[PDB]
Write an enzyme that holds these catalytic residues in place. Structure first.
Site: not given
Lengths: 76, 116
Positions: A76, B65, B88-90
């Site tokens: 993600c 995010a 990448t979102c955390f």
């Protein structure tokens, strides 16, 4: 036969394959040459993502064709 | 505004998951960061977080995010051929228990150099 797998930085990998080899089999050869597990590999030929179930023959990949290696390292 | 990533600010505001400051992959990670030039440090920061720029208050104010997510090194039970994984979102990097500093170093360099 012989195909090339080009990385993002232009590094070119030469594999000895056969049109009957499956995409999973081709990724196994990439690991032997580069130490990258197949689950972290994404293969693209002619702008299409290669699925593990099909073969090189299913995608019309012939000798001296160039595949692109994309690393699936970010979820993600 | 200095164009260098504050590695002390980075290190002090990094959480560890299934590892301690005495874990090999943590010591090897920061040694690799110490020997990374500025380009590779920025490529590493963007690999894990999605951008090479730190917030104005430093790594303590790092956001994900869905809210505050400190930079996290996570030692995972994975096959040591795996390259480091990033979320990448955390802002987390998942690192297998590599057998040597050399292996972590090359795997990490491959991850941040052959991505995007």
């Amino acid at each position: 036969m012989q195909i090339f797998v080009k990385t993002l930085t232009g590094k070119t990998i030469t594999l000895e394959v056969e049109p009957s080899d499956t995409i999973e089999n081709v990724k196994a050869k990439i690991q032997d040459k580069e130490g990258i597990p197949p689950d972290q590999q994404r293969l693209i030929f002619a702008g299409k993502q290669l699925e593990d179930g099909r073969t090189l023959s299913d995608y019309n990949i012939q000798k001296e064709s160039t595949l692109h290696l994309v690393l699936r390292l970010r979820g993600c | 505004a200095m164009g260098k990533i504050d590695v002390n600010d980075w290190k002090v505001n990094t959480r560890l998951k299934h590892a301690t400051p005495d874990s090999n992959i943590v010591k090897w990670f920061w040694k690799a960061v110490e020997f990374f030039d500025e380009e590779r440090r920025a490529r590493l920061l963007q690999f894990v977080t999605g951008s090479s720029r730190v917030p104005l208050q430093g790594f303590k104010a790092l956001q994900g995010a869905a809210g505050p997510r400190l930079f996290t090194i996570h030692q995972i039970d994975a096959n040591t051929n795996n390259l480091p994984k990033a979320h990448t979102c955390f802002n987390r990097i998942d690192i297998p228990p590599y057998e040597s500093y050399e292996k972590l170093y090359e795997k990490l360099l491959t991850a941040i150099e052959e991505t995007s």
